[PDB]
Every structure is written in C-alpha cells, then in structure tokens.
Symmetry: D2
Subunit: 467 residues, 4 copies
C-alpha cells in the first residue's frame, strides 16, 4: 500500500458531517492535523493553496514512475548509454530529503547539524570506518550548496532513485573505471557533478519542455487523486474567509487539473448543482514563480482565459471575480485580498511579514502506519540509549545493539529509512517541518474534521532546566 492508496482510500469515503462523527474521526492519526505552533482558526481571514501535491495529489508510484521514465528517455536522447532504458523505478528506495554529494556521488541522509545518518554510493550502503574516509567527522556542511544538493521535493523522488541507478550502473559496468569523484570510459573522465547536472537539466526539461504534463493530462484517473470532499471543504472555508490559489503552473495546465478535481455530478455536497472550479476561489494566480513570488516577485499580469495567453495590460482596480492573475508577488495577493500575514493560512507541499503555514506531507499516511508498528523497536532504542548513559556514569556492546535495532527499524520504511528519522535521530527534514510548518498532515482534507473556530494547540515547550 502506497501513501497515495491511503489518501485515495479515505477519498472514497463520503463525508458524515454530524458533530461527533467528525470528533471521533480526528482521533485516528491519519485524519488528524498535527500542531507545531498554536493557531486560532477563528482568526484566519484567508486560505491560500498551492496546486501540486496539495489540491492535486499525484498517485504514487505511478507519477514518480512516469517522471523517472521520461527523464531516463531524455538522458538517452542527449547521449547517455542505452542501458539506462532497462532501469525501472523502485518506490522502496528513495526517501525524500536526501542529499546528493556531487563530489563523491553518494546519497546522504543527515540530521539538522550535518551528522551523517545514512550513506549510499549507488546501491551500496557505506558504514563506519569507510564513511570516515570521505566524511572525516561523519559530517557535511549542507550550506556548501555548490557540492551538496538537497532532494527536498516530491518531484525530486524519481531523480533520487535515478542518481543511485546511474552511480550503480557506471560503478558496475566494465566499460567504465571507477574514480573517487566520477568514472572513466577509457581516457574520458566524467565527474559525478557533471552527471548530477545532466540529470537535474533532464528533470527540468521533462517538466518545462517535455511530455510530463501531456502524459498526465491524458490519463488523470491514473495519475491524480480525485476526492469528492474537496469542494465541500473549500465551500466551507469560503463561508468563513477568502480562498485563493497561487500556483507555478500555467493557466492551461491548472484549468485541466482543477476541472478534473471538481468533476463530480454535483457541487459542494451530493445533490447540489455542479459549479466551475473557479467559483471556489476569491483570487486565482498562476505562473507564480515561487519562491521568487515570496520576495520581489515579478510584474503582475492577467490571463485571457479564452486563449490561455497573457492579456496586454492588467486590471488595476480592486478584486472582482472572473479575473485570473499571473506572476506578481505574495504582497500583491495581500493587497488584493485586504488581509496581511498572520490572517493568512497558506496550504502547500513545500517548506520555503509572515503567512501561517499548513504543510501537506503525503508520505505521512504510510509513515504513520509504520510508526505504530515499530513502537516497540523505538521504545527499545530509548531504553538502550538511557542504559548506555547509565554505564558511562559508572563490556559495552550496547552500541552494536543500538546500531542493529536502528537498522531494523529503518528498513521497514524502505532502504533509505523514514523521512523523519533514522532510529532515535531526527532528519534535517523533520527539523525543518518543526521549524517552518505551524500545522501539518498527510492531506489538507483533514481540516474538514475540525470546526472552523478550532484552536489548534501546540504542546508547551520547556527548556531542559524548566522540566
């Protein structure tokens, strides 16, 4: 069961909206909204949305698999060897948030402080003594952005796997000779950095210039989760505040996707008349150019919605319906909606004054199921950790047991472990979720199970001396 199977299983449920129905439903972890920082819902005046992996949850492993194959085909088409065509996408290998080391050709899982949790070269997992040869203190400086690339997004999933496949292919194929920083074909030296750049370029091309969008849109049932509860949540939000869409996609793609997502023989609830997806938003903005959108942005433009092209000129005046914007900035959205900063909840799949944030983490659906299965393994980890400290206070192969249990726990998630941790150690990714997302969940649909004056309450944080 993929995480998107879990989302699609819950998506097939009709909404029972009775008071205690919604109450007993948000006991179940997969349907809860988790809280890093308290947030009074009653004080939210606008709800903003990204499209991709937020409203439009691409099905897994199919969509990753499509991205992977189109990227492989782009690499072959620009000169990569034919053997690449025999790769097939394996959803059990990649974990989101890995670091690619372009110097050595390794994928690294790290904590917030640069400590290495997992190191793999191709499909070989480096450990202990041999890791320290390339990572002296088992440490990487993540802000050496010229060397290390953080594979942070869900669109980075196929290329996470592809990079491993390639290092493995060049490392094991006898045409090639392995080096520390790349590989030779006869006297021809190819660095892992050049190779990483070709992949990155090929992923960009598939998205901006290749057939990814085209192939998605011809089979939306295969590639995109559809949930009848979407128009219901959005119409409920529009009762209590304004709703907006800000997406990086162009207008034609957004329209095709959004039309599919609202394509039910009904509107908010069954039995009601269907309405156009545009009717659910007070403001629709495409070609947003995030993350630049959140800074200086680009000039505000306006789409001719019959042609999908930009108008010559932009409607100057106040917010009125019918209009679709393009570019601009998040500050321009505030001005148009008449609401600033903490009055705004922005719901998206990516971790980037000051809007409140709801982070959708689609993997959380499967992570939650494994987490509860492993509870014993984690509890033992805590005990060993506690007992180890007891020994040092005043033979001591508790360390090897700690190493063993940590591996076992991790393998249940896939080869690169949990998104959020390796054994008792939190990932870079988990720390950034905690620092940057006020609220997070497997799906934003989970908001539907809470009343709109709900006070989301974070646990009181105490310093070590306060506890």
């Amino acid at each position: 069961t993929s995480w998107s199977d879990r989302l699609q299983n819950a998506a097939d449920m009709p909404a029972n909206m009775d008071k205690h129905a919604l109450k007993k439903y948000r006991r179940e972890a997969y349907h809860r909204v988790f809280v890093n920082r308290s947030l009074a819902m009653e004080k939210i005046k606008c709800f903003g949305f990204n499209m991709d992996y937020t409203l439009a949850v691409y099905k897994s492993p199919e969509y990753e698999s499509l991205g992977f194959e189109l990227t492989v085909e782009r690499l072959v088409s620009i000169g990569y060897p034919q053997e690449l065509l025999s790769f097939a996408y394996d959803s059990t290998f990649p974990t989101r948030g890995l670091v690619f080391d372009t110097l050595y050709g390794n994928l690294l899982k790290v904590d917030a402080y640069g400590n290495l949790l997992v190191c793999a070269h191709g499909f070989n997992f480096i450990r202990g003594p041999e890791t320290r040869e390339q990572y002296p203190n088992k440490f990487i400086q993540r802000d050496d952005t010229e060397r290390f690339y953080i594979l942070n997004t869900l669109f980075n999933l196929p290329e996470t796997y592809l990079l491993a496949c390639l290092v493995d292919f060049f490392t094991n194929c006898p045409r090639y000779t392995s080096c520390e920083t790349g590989f030779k074909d006869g006297d021809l030296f190819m660095s892992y950095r050049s190779m990483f750049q070709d992949v990155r370029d090929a992923v960009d091309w598939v998205h901006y210039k290749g057939s990814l969008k085209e192939k998605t849109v011809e089979n939306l049932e295969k590639y995109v989760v559809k949930d009848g509860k979407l128009p219901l949540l959005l119409s409920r939000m529009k009762e209590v505040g304004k709703v907006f869409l800000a997406t990086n996609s162009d207008y034609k793609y957004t329209d095709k996707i959004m039309t599919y997502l609202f394509d039910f023989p009904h509107g908010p609830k069954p039995g009601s008349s269907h309405r156009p997806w545009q009717s659910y938003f007070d403001l629709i903005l495409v070609d947003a150019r995030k993350p630049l959108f959140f800074g200086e942005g680009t000039v505000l433009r306006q789409v001719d919605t019959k042609t999908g092209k930009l108008k010559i000129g932009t409607y100057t005046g106040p917010l009125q319906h019918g209009i679709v914007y393009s570019g601009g900035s998040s500050d321009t959205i505030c001005d148009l909606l008449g609401a600033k900063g903490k009055d705004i909840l922005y719901i998206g799949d990516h971790i980037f004054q000051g809007w409140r944030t709801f982070l959708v983490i689609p993997e959380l659906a499967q992570e939650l199921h494994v987490w509860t299965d492993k509870s014993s393994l984690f509890e033992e980890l805590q005990s060993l950790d506690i007992f180890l400290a007891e020994l040092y206070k005043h033979i001591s192969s508790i360390q090897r047991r700690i190493k063993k249990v940590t591996h076992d726990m991790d393998m249940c998630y896939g080869m690169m472990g949990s998104l959020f941790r390796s054994g008792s150690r939190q990932t870079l990714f988990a720390s950034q979720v905690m620092r940057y997302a006020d609220l997070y969940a497997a799906s934003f649909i989970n908001l539907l199970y809470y009343p709109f004056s709900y006070l989301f309450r974070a646990a009181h944080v105490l310093m070590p001396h306060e506890s």
Copy 2:
C-alpha cells in the same frame, strides 16, 4: 540576592570530591549542567574557554553599575545634558536579549517568530491597542538589522537600562517635545536612532578607550568572582585532554584577571604548590577578534610576554609551552592542538566544521530560584491555555485571566520579565540557547560534579505525530 551572589555563595564552598558527594550535588538545579543535545564527555579531546563572564564572572550589580556610570559620564562629556548624571543603575529593570527599536525608541521582548511579548517606551509599558499602532500585527522582523538592535550580551545590560532612562528623560523633560521617531529641543530634531548610536559609541569607547578595565583591575575583589575550585576543574580537564584560552582581551588585561583568578595560597587543591595561571592551558590566544575569529580570522601573531606587545614574527612550528598567540582563527587553534570540530568543547558566555558548545548563563542562578517559586503560576497558565482551546472546540474572559497571570509571573523576574519566556511564550533568547548550546549552566564550574566520561543525555525529541 543577585545571580552573582549565588555563584559567589557556591564559590565559597570547598570541593568534596567523594563519589556520592558529587552525585547528590548535581541533583540540585543550580549545580547541574543542562543538555539540549547529547554529548559524550569521554570523546572530548580539548576544552576551550572564553575569559569574560566565563572564567571571569563579573559581580552583579556592581560591574553593570560601573559600566553604566562610565557610559553616562562619556555621554555628558560629549554633549549630553547634565541631568544624565542623576541616573542610577537599576538591576531590576533590564532583562538580557531585548530589542531596541531605533525607529520608535522602544525596548521589545520578542519570541523566535517576531511576536511581541513586551513593549516599553522609556519606563512606560505599552499594551494591547496602542502597541498595534506601531506594530501592526504585533510583529517585528528581527533581521531588519538597520532598525532593530538585539541587546544580547551581558555587556549590553547597562545600555539596555540607559536607553530606557534616556527615552524616559527626553519624554518627560519639558525642554523637549516628543515625536514618533525622536524628540525636539526647540526646532532641533534628534532621532532615537542617533541617540541609540551615541550610546552604542559611548559603550564601545568605555570598553576600548575609557577607564572600565582600569577601574575593574584596581578593585578585583569588588568586580570579579574568585573561586578556588577553578584550578581544580582545569587541572582535572588537562588530565583527560588539552585546555585552551581564546579571548578578545589583550594580554595585559588577561594576565591581570587570570592572575587574580588563580591567586590562592595553593594550586589545584589546598595543600598543593601554587602555579602560574599559564600552566593550566596548552594554548593561550588573546586579541582573538571574535566573531571574525570563527571565520577568516586575522593573521596569527605572538605576544612578547615581558612587554605585553606583539613580537615581530610568529613562531611557525608545533605547539610548545611558553608561547602566547594573538589573533589568528579557530581553524589555526585546531591545527595547533591537533584536534577538529566535535573533539572540541568550547565554553563561553556568548551564542555565535563545528565545535561543541557549553553556554554559561550567569542569570540562570536567579532564574532557577524564581522558576521553582512560580511553578504554580506556570501550571495555572497551562490549564487556562488548555481550557481555552476546549471552549473554542465548542463568556470567554479566560483571555484576560491569561493576560493577568502572565504579567504576575513575569514581574517576579523584574520589569522586563524572565530571560527565557513571558508566561507560556519562549523568548528569542531561549530558542537560540536551545538551537546553539549543546550544554548550558549558570556556571562552567558545574562540570566538576560530573565524571569525565559522563554521557550528557538530551531528551529524545518527537514530532507532534510521533507522541
């Protein structure tokens, strides 16, 4: 009782070094080392020290009071009105870590996200509706470094108070007319920013060009804590690894201070021969120029210890005793000591690859005593917070009670509240301690009560969905 009275009270204790003596002593909060991130002491190869507020704990309120009066006298001497001489330092007003808003002339206490916890203009505490006139969402952007200055250090204590005294003086004196961004004397407009810059300049002058050092050094008994347990801890550290000093002070000041700190009729333990302070360090570095020291540093120089002046030339070769360095960088120290990054524990009073860190927070001695007195007040705060969320889930003047209890709790610390929080809300400062200090305590002497293979163990951190 000042925090430095607490440190000086514990400093008058001889060291009972029996096994269970040290065990039962580090139950008591004021003598514990607190742990943000686990640290195996057995793996530490070098211990590094800042001098000021670390080895040399300046007595409070006397030292702040000396800084304050010399700074006031500098301002008068450069053209400030005579009424400044009737100011007297009040240790109950300043809390460390306040933000001075140079636009409006307010001191602000803030959380890590920019939310205003406390706003005071002079000695008037702005609240609710009137705060929102200048701080629209009750929010400041701390990284607008041209407007906001964070009064982060213990040397900033007198000027925190001085800035308040000045705004209060100009605001209430009838020679002057108040404006939003400063004040007039007839047609003469003086901004709060100019005024803040004069104070900052005057504090710098007192330290670098005035009589602060001179007045300290003529009365060390009045201004500096002396603790006979210092040579004992340091000699214990030198048994298990290397010890170094890196200070911003010049050689003559360091020598005067360090000689006083080792001035006992004995060495490590009573009954042992006294030794020079220099014998306790494998490496001594002065004129360090922190924080530049931690980056590119400056060229490595060497002090002629009979004159206190730089030698022409620097000893190129390996670490040998007798030598005192000047300038250089933290990377140069690693090279000389033959140990990198996580092998090093650096002990200092200020929050700035990668050395482990022990943060000395002298105020923690008094904060800990108030914390335990207020436990009831905090517990009520938690209950109200929890009960408030219960109401919103489905008249509601729980908010006014929350506002009231928060004030009451805060006033026990002084007018600007606790260093670490305002009621249930953590300060910017507390967050930075948690992010940047592996270990922290009221005093580094607390290390003496733990065995040198101790494993300092942080609580396992769980994400909201893991708990």
Copy 3:
C-alpha cells in the same frame, strides 16, 4: 549600400599578396586596422575567434530583417495584437548601443558620462525643454540596470527598431490611452517595462527555441558573407602561432556555418586542395557560455562529432587534433594551448589575467564612408565650439547653429545618428571601444594586409598639461 555590401564587395576581391600591393591597400581606411593600444604582432602566440559577426558576418539588412519578423511573429503568437504583423524592418532607424528606458519607453543615445545626446519616444524625437521633464539634468545613470537596458549587440538591432515600433503603435492607436510609464487598454494598464520584457523574452526564444537558425542555414547565401580570403588568413596565422575557435553556438550550427564559410573549390589559395574547416584550428570550443566563459566558466565537456551530442566523459590529456570541446573556461583554453594573457589575441564582435583584443565593428565600413563625406560638417562644428568659448571669455546664437549642424551631420547616418558620436560628442559605445579594444576594424580580414611581425602603434597619449 549596407555595411555588409561593402564587406561583400571587398570579399569578392582575390588576394594580391605582393609586398607593395598589401602596403598601398592598407592606406584605404576601410581596409585598415585601427589601434587604441600598441600591439607587437610578433609577440602573439595564439589567435582566438568568436564565430558570429566575426567569421560569420550576417548580411544586412536581411539578417536583422529575419530576426525582426520572427520576433514579431513570436509576440503575436503569445498575445500581442495583429497590427504587429504590418511592421517592416527599417535599417535606417536603429543605431547600435542605444539605451532603452523601461520607465518611460524612450530610446536614448548617451555619452560615457550619462549625458543624453538623443531621446526618442516611438518615432518622435524629444528635444530641449520636454526632455528635461523626464531627465532633469539631461542625465541617466546607466548602472541602474533595472531601469536601463543597453542595446549593445548586433543581435539587438531588430529589437531596437521593434521597441520604437511598439511604443509608436500603442501611442498612436486609439484602442489605447498613453500614460507616462506605459499605456491603457480600457482599465488594463501595461507598463513599458513589461512590454520590454516580452520583447527581450521573444528575441531570446527566436534564438534559442524558434526558427532563426533553421531559416539562416537553409539560405546561407542570402544571410552570411562568404570570403575566399578567410582560409588564406587563417592558414597564415597557423604558420606563426596557434588558432582557436570559442563560440556560444552548439556544434551542429557551428559546423553548418563553418562548412559554408570554407566551401570553395580550394583550400587556403586557389589551386590548392580544399580542407575541412576543422583543420584550420588547433582548438575548437563550442557552447562556450560567454561571458561566464571568461570567469568561472562551466565544466569542460567534449562533443561526439558524429552525433553532435556531448560525450560521457572528457579527454583529460594534452591538446590533440580531432577533439571538439564544449563549455569550460578561457583559463582552460590557455592551459590547453600552453599560452597565457598577452600572448593571446582574441578576435570578436563584442566588448566584454588578460587577453589582447581585436574588435570587429561591421558598421565601420559605412561609418567610414559617411565620416569622410561629413568632414566639412565636423570641421565647422569644431570652429563653432572654439568660437563659442572665445565669446564667453569676453547675441550668442552660435548655440542654435551648433544644435543645427549637429542634427544635419547626424541624419546622414540614419535617424539615431552615428554609432560613435552625436556631432562633437562621443557615444558611450565609442568610449568603450577605446577603453576595451586594443585593435578594431570593419572586418578581421584586414589583418591579411599587414605582415605578421607588424608593430601596431597607437598614438602617444598626452594629458592636457603635457600638450
């Protein structure tokens, strides 16, 4: 007669290489190499070449006209009104080096100090009092790169004209209302900056993603000057040093163009066997990414010349023939050729340690012919200028005569005047030629008329007090 007609007329000449034939030929201005800074040819070890407008001189006005029409068609295709299709390229309007002011929608000709020489909004030439309304001291700051874009290159010729056509169209068409900073279509405001960005984007697209290259290469006789003297000069250079090509074009385009340029029934001289264009270069580098090429560059790659695609890997070793590189940097070229800086003459059409520089200015052929026709007009300008200063030393409508003669002289060049001056005032462009080009000429073929040990001699420069 276009400048490229002049180049093509001289290109139809066979080379008479007798000693005094070449001597009497380089008396004639159009065949001379002009010298800003002395250069001993005997000391040059390598000759480097850009392709475009250097080896491959695109015919004018045809090539500009092709660029213009493909750019117009791109704008219409993305939403610009149909009336754009009735524009036709006018080679008499643009002068190279104009500044587009994106705030006001004006083309400006300026001197090196920011002084306005010519201001045109669409096809209306603003003068005197009305210029000072938008340019207070008749001055622009060229390094305000967000506002002002310098239309420096020969590829900028069509868009120089296009920008004028567009401002004129929107200004005179009654669908639209004129504003200071753009224009309205009803309530729709379009800024000149947005409009400039669309043009710039459309020019980029025509070059990188549209049919410009395709249409060039299907009719090379119409679009590119062919000169039988090219292989002769290059073979002469290869006798005395190394020859290299560094171009931004990809391999397939370069090969098509370069094959055409060497397509004669003969090699260096008539009667000799034809050889491949590649045989004339010790080093060939494509996808150079200038100007980044001159700094950090990109990784050095290698082209598979049978497919036109990059090889996986790059030949590590010393320079050997057969190899074609891609990317890299100018420092990598030096390493490969074994010659640095002043040992290298780089021949190109664009003004960008330290290679010597030969600047090809194709317009110089027509500018030289007008210059000599206007000699009287310029001489009068000097006299009026001198006589004006005589009056002020001690009614004075010498200023209006100076204004009149300056206009008359300028109109002989086209509407925006000479590339190098407006009357007695030198352009920004002329100053940059003098500062940055050691040698310059209408064509690099002019090198053929000088012996290869020639000492190019600049006039001794004297300061005003030395003269």
Copy 4:
C-alpha cells in the same frame, strides 16, 4: 625647490586683477587650469571645497616628514626595533600612486592596464628577467585588493617611503633572514602583509589618536601654506554662486586651520575689514566621512560651535547662516543648497547624480617644471618608438636605447619617476585624473585668473579611425 615652495612663491604675489594682467598670467603653465572635459563656468551655481591639500596645502617636505617621524615613533612604541628611529624622510624617493604588493614586499608603479612600469623591493630596483619571476607577464591585477594596496593620497607619501625603508632594513639587517613573502628572526616568521598592516594601523593612529594635528596646529607657519589671495577668490565665487566646505576633519581642527588661512590684517582685498572664515561659506559641513559621504552618508548632525561638540538635535529647516553641520551626505548638501549635480563644482585633492570636479594636484608645480626641461628626452622617446615600428614593418637594439632614455627621463623626477608616466607610458594615476577630473591644476587659486563666465574647453577627442 619643493612643489609647495612653488605654491608658496606664487602665494607671496599680490593679485593684479586688471583684465590683461590675468590674461597673460594664465599663459604660464603653473598658473593654468587644465581641462579634461569642457565646463561652462557660467552655469556653475555652487562651489564646494575639501579642506586638506585643497584650502590647506601642507608644506613639503616638512609635513610628510612630520607624519613619517610620528609614524616611526608609533611603530617603535608598539614593538618595532629601535633601528627605525634612525630612518629619515627622503622626499626624493616616493611618487604618489605606487602599489604596495603585500605578498612580495615590493612597491610597483603601474599603468591603467596592470602593466608594471617600475618595481622596487626596499631600495633595490628589480628589472627585466628577475621581475618576471614574481610577475609572470609583468602584470598585476589591481582589483585584487587583498594583495595590492594603492598609495593614492598625499597622506600616503610618508608610508610609501616608510614601507621601502622597512623592507630595506629587514632585508639588509643580519638578525633577519629574507624569504619570498616576508622575513625571519630566528624561527619567527613575519610576513610583509602583517608588516604593511602595522604601518597602515600606525598611520591611522597618528592621524586619529596621535599628535599629528597637535603638532601641526602649534606651528602653522611651518606646516601650512598661507595665501592672501584665498579670501579674494572665495568672495568672488560667492558673488556668482554659493560656496560650501565639506571636510572629514572635526570642527576644532577645521576652525584652527581655517582661522589661520584667513589670518590677514584684511578681508578679501587689502584695505578691507577682516572677516571670520565662516562668512565666506553658505554651508559648512565637518566630520563628513568621505567617501561614505558620497553614498548613503551618516545622519545629519549639527555642531555647537562654542564647545566644538555635537548638539542634541539638528536644525530641520532651510539653510540659514551661523549653523555648522556634521556628517550627513552629499545629497543632503544639494537639498540644503537647492542645487543638483552639474550645477556643482567640487574642488578637492582626491579622486573618488554627479558633481563636476576640480582636482588639485600639488605636485603638478614641480612636475610641470621637469616636464619642460625633459621635452627633448620625450621627443626622442617618440622618435625611437616610431622608428622601432618602422623596423618591424620591414640589429634592433633600439629597445635598449628606449629602456635607457626612459630611465634617464624618470630619474629627473625622483627614484620612482613622474606621477603621470614612466617615459612614454602613462601611469594608473594619470588615467584616473583624465577619467575623473573635469578640471585640474597645481592649485585651485588658478581659478582666480579666469573670468567667472569662462568656458573651459577640452580638446575634441577623436577615435583612431576619425583622425
């Protein structure tokens, strides 16, 4: 005869102000204003002045000699060896504008393109083959500001000489061993960069914290040129526009100096009543902080002229007399004077929108006298250069004669040659004068010999192809 003897000789002349008296006086080079760029004096609305080396011309070699000795004494006082006290300042060695290479300890004279004209290590002049060992193409990159320091100002004269004295001392003294990048005293290595930084620090200290100002002001007759024609020129300027002073000096120093400069028993002309120096300026600004003054500046303050200290507050309103400002910016001056950019002539000794510029070059007085003596030597240089090019066109020891004559010409200026050239090659400094100074002269007093509607006329500049 020093350059300041020449200025003081002309300063002893009374002003004969008859029409043709002033006409025949500005035939003589030493009394002319030279013109790089034309400037209509009739269009100038404000005249701005720096103080130092502009209004206050420090006598040479005395003032350099005072700076030198106080700097030497500062170095000894901070640990430099006693032998430094036996240095004596030699005004024949330094030429302004030399580059100190902190890597190798050489002074370099360079042209605008980085070409080495003169290289000296201590007092040894490196030539030919041995220069190329450290400067591969005889070239330095001046914008490598971490390595190369340009000794641009007249205050840099003593330290130019001092740096040479020191390299010579450490190189020839047998306590020390020479290295490529510094020198050893036993095992102690001292780099030339550290040594350069100590000198630079010591020069700064002498100026800001030592006795330079004090020693100047106690003997103004010895250190500062006094010219009775100063009040006359300034009063003439104030007839036709506004006059302002912007200086980096504080108020007390400025007042002492300016009082001395106006200390005559008369005002503008003999026979007229004396007036205070302040009466000659519409605006007086001290503590200007140039060059920051020309950018963002610092806050505008106001001096209490009875105490010399800053007022608390600044007079907000329009320009009125009596007021003395401090800090601020050049934009603030424009606002106060009601005149922008090209309406302003700024007269100073240093080469730094857009004020017109008059550069005072005190050395020009002696340079002009040598220039005319060497006219033959330069004319031969031109002939050899021309004849050399004639040979290469088609044994050739014209090069050694060119090398010889160039040396001979140069030695007439002092050991480091002319400020403006080495033989036929212009210095970096000469190029910057030509690029940045509209007008220049040995003294600004030269303005007195031109009528105030004079049109300063630059020679028409032609490109090589236009001539």
